[PDB]
Amino acid sequence: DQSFLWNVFQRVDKDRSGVISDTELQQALSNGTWTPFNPVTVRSIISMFDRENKAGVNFSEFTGVWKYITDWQNVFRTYDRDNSGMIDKNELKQALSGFGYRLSDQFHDILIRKFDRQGRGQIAFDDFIQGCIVLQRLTDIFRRYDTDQDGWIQVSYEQYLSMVFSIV
């Protein structure tokens, strides 16, 4: 239904540039609350789908964007089983586990603390995508060294530094 998406695109593409910018995409997105969708999350979604390095998405790339956001709303709902419109510690544990991450209980606390911009120990839709993208990024860094894929790496000092230089 590219026809629907094209109408969506046009509405979102406010300045009619033919490309959706970060500030245009943000206005179009809801995190379920009355705060603007996390601008860092917005910029990561643009980066993930922009193929032309233009700080924006054209129509074709927006179709990827729409599918990605929609796939995340569905996951966010699947795991928000108590219909708060926020994901909780227990719900996060079910989510990440469902995703195939094996992580200690106290680590889930570090994740909440790092990503919950609301401050109630519950994760909003925009912050949930964000934390999942960081995990994804960090894991890609890791699995470049986890050769026999057993979740242990042995790295030299210089390998470590370049790992971190490509995060921060």
Partner: peptide, 15 residues
Amino acid sequence: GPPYPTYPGYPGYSQ
């Protein structure tokens, strides 16, 4: 296997 997904367990693992 690893303590992390190695196949498309969340959106968009291949993106």
